[PDB]
Design a protein around this ligand. Structure first.
Ligand SMILES: *[C@@H]1O[C@H](CO)[C@@H](O)[C@H](O)[C@H]1NC(C)=O
Ligand SMILES: *[C@@H]1O[C@H](CO)[C@@H](O)[C@H](O)[C@H]1NC(C)=O
Ligand SMILES: *[C@@H]1O[C@H](CO)[C@@H](O)[C@H](O)[C@H]1NC(C)=O
Lengths: 281, 138, 50, 99, 148
């Protein structure tokens, strides 16, 4: 079962400026009080990222590409974003990959599905029980061939919450290199209305998987009879990575404190060629 | 007759079942050659106080030389120091005067000089800021 | 002092290059090939370091 | 496998050429000369060894080889074999299998 | 004067090696010691992956009638490693255990289960007469005799 929801208002795509976000630990080495110059896939400074939001009247979950990894950010409350799909075709013309954070477990698997146009999960609201009960699970229509599967430990995650300002600032960055799917992540407490803040904070590694398939597109899964609904206020942002060179500053404890982009403007290029954060006259 | 056929394959995709790893005991304070998760090296290991993050394994230096490791089986930090080396010098008056000599091991604390041997514990071991002097009297 | 430190630093830093060989670690070349082929790699390495 | 530095059963277990070889090799088929339809099992080669042998060394020992971890005694036992093995030399074989 | 010779080094003494506290084994008991297997015409197929394989405990066991490997030397299986594992389990006659080799002929090798000319893998067979045999004849196990 899977049906199209079209009750929305229309808006044009919105862009926003990502000042200094999306820096992760490139490797597992430890360093202290050093400035190290690295080359890798990063998110360029002061770039413009695409902005999607679900409010009240809006339900936006389109299919977007996936090249050289992506930086996915979310300012949210009530845990409305849940899933992620990947694959070359997403229609059983080729293999497919799936990650989900259910209300009970976190599931990962590679199989051959056939996703609908608008798959989603749907949670009922305050149906006399005060417990938003998740009952709609419409991701795929079948699962033909499987070569690897896994499921983690069940848990309990609240499906309720209403705040005037989004509290969870979840940052994720995904890559797929030579048959390894890498996921870095970080969580932050924020009090901001409808923007991604100004500040510096690095992203630790979380997972590596040996999948080994071609991935070219992806799509999100959002928490909501066959028409009519209510989505909690939430916003997510998408940006793409490119190969760049950065200068990273490790402090006494080996935690990244600051970074410099060696292709933004000439002053930064000078800093980068001298390998220091201050340049003399 | 009950029969089972194994139909594995080699060396074309990232392995998923490998299995064969075995480990010996851990020693300290003597120049040994070690292999920590494919990190091969040689030196002497000591107990350190560096504070790794949970996900970090190695540790590197200004010139990119490893100088700290984390024990895979018990999560602790070990500091690596290369064991000693240096040149040998012979102090001699001309052979026209005598066939006697003195030996200088430069840059070595001669609590471990021994590792010709007679000039390794011969008549004295005198410590100077330039190294250990053997065969000459203070 | 600055010039002396810098020269020594770059000397030490030249030990992590390839010079055209397969790997910069001698033990990995030795423990992955046969002696009739590891020679052609070790020769490149020693030439560069010299 | 005769050329210097090669690998394989022969070059590794019975006849080893040094890497600084300075000499020549001559080889020609003798099918119609020494091959018999019944099989010239006078020709034996060594199949197993504890380790490879040094250049220009010759091994003639016939002590049985042990494959499995368990030790063996006597003349025969499980996973413990007489290392020698004979060729199936007949003229009927395909190319290469002839002497 | 004073002259220089003969650098020296401390010459390390012993060796050492460490690795993670590996503990996640492969469930071989469920494919080797299962209560009942399938017949040769319906050889059961079980996949193993993402686990730790220990071939020593099975190679040293002598209760197996035959342990014939072709793509790898028996001692090296505990030093190399793999991408996929698949086990094909069945039951045959004691006289047809020689036909399961790749490239051979016979009713089983030509009608039920064939091994490719370049099979990379191993075959492990053992007698279990007293396990699934009865006086009246356990006819549940049967083979293929006629095929196009
Ligand atoms: C990014 O998008 C914004 C949207 O208004 C635009 O003004 C800006 O010029 C864009 N910058 C680049 C580098 O594309
Ligand atoms: C580094 O960590 C230690 C504790 O591990 C802490 O006391 C210290 O304050 C940290 N560094 C700084 C600059 O605060
Ligand atoms: C030199 O004299 C001091 C006393 O002033 C004595 O302690 C020391 O041992 C003497 N050194 C030598 C080499 O005899």
């Amino acid at each position: 079962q899977c049906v199209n929801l079209t009750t929305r208002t229309q808006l044009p795509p919105a862009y926003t400026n990502s000042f200094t976000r999306g820096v992760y630990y490139p490797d597992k080495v430890f360093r202290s009080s050093v400035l190290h110059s690295t080359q890798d896939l990063f998110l360029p400074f002061f770039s413009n990222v695409t902005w999607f939001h679900a409010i009240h009247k809006r339900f936006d979950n389109p299919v977007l590409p996936f090249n050289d990894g992506v930086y996915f950010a979310s300012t949210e409350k009530s845990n409305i974003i849940r899933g992620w799909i990947f694959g070359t075709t997403l229609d059983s013309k080729t293999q497919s990959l799936l990650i989900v954070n259910n209300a009970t477990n976190v599931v990962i698997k590679v199989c051959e599905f056939q996703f609908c146009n608008d798959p989603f999960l749907g949670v009922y609201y305050h149906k006399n029980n005060k417990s938003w009960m998740e009952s709609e699970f419409r991701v795929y229509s079948s699962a033909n061939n499987c070569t690897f599967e896994y499921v983690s430990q069940p848990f309990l995650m609240d499906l309720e919450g209403k705040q005037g300002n989004f509290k969870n600032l979840r940052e994720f960055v995904f890559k797929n290199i030579d048959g390894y799917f890498k996921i870095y992540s970080k969580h932050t407490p924020i009090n901001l209305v409808r923007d991604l803040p100004q500040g510096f904070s690095a992203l630790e590694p979380l997972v590596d998987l040996p999948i080994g398939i071609n991935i070219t597109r992806f799509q999100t899964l959002l928490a909501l009879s066959s028409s009519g609904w209510t989505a909690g206020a939430a916003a997510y942002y998408v940006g793409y990575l490119q190969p760049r060179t950065f200068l990273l500053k490790y402090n006494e404890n080996g935690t990244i404190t600051d970074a410099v982009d060696c292709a933004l403007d000439p002053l930064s290029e000078t800093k980068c060629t001298l390998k220091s954060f201050t340049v003399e006259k | 007759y009950r029969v089972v056929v194994l139909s594995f394959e080699l060396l074309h995709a990232p392995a998923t079942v490998c299995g064969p790893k075995k480990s010996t005991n851990l020693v300290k304070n003597k120049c040994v050659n070690f292999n920590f998760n494919g990190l091969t090296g040689t030196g002497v290991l000591t107990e350190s106080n560096k504070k790794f993050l949970p996900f970090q394994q190695f540790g590197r230096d200004i010139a990119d030389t490893t100088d700290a490791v984390r024990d895979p089986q018990t999560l602790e930090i070990l500091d690596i120091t290369p064991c000693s080396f240096g040149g040998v010098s012979v102090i001699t008056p001309g052979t026209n005067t005598s066939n006697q000599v003195a030996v200088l091991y430069q840059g070595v604390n001669c609590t471990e000089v021994p590792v010709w041997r007679v000039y390794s514990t011969g008549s004295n071991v005198f410590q100077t800021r330039a190294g250990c002097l053997i065969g000459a009297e203070h | 002092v600055n010039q002396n430190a810098q020269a020594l630093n770059t000397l030490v830093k030249q030990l992590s290059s390839n010079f055209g060989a397969i790997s910069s670690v001698l033990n990995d070349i030795l423990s992955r090939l046969d002696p009739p082929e590891a020679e052609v790699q070790i020769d490149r390495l020693i030439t560069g370091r010299l | 496998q005769i050329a210097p530095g090669q690998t394989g059963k022969i070059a590794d277990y019975n006849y080893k050429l040094p890497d600084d070889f300075t000499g020549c090799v001559i080889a020609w088929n003798s099918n119609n000369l020494d091959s018999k339809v019944g099989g010239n099992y006078n020709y034996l080669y060594r199949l197993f060894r504890k380790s490879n042998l040094k250049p220009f060394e010759r091994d003639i020992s016939t002590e049985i080889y042990q494959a499995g971890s368990t030790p063996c005694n006597g003349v025969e036992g499980f996973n413990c074999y007489f290392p020698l093995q004979s060729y199936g030399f007949q003229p009927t074989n395909g190319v290469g299998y002839q002497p | 004067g004073i002259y220089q010779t003969s650098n020296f080094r401390v010459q390390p003494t012993e060796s050492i090696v460490r690795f993670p506290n590996i503990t996640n084994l492969c469930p071989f008991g469920e494919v080797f010691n299962a209560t009942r297997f399938a017949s040769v015409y319906a050889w059961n197929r079980k996949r193993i992956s993402n686990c730790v394989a220990d071939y020593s405990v099975l190679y040293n066991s002598a209760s197996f009638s035959t342990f014939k490997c072709y793509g790898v030397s028996p001692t090296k299986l505990n030093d190399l490693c793999f991408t996929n594992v698949y086990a094909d389990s069945f039951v045959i006659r004691g006289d047809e255990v020689r036909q399961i080799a790749p490239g051979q002929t016979g009713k089983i090798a030509d009608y039920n289960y064939k091994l490719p000319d370049d099979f990379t893998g191993c075959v492990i067979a053992w007698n279990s007469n007293n396990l699934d045999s009865k006086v009246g004849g356990n006819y549940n196990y049967l083979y293929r005799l006629f095929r196009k």
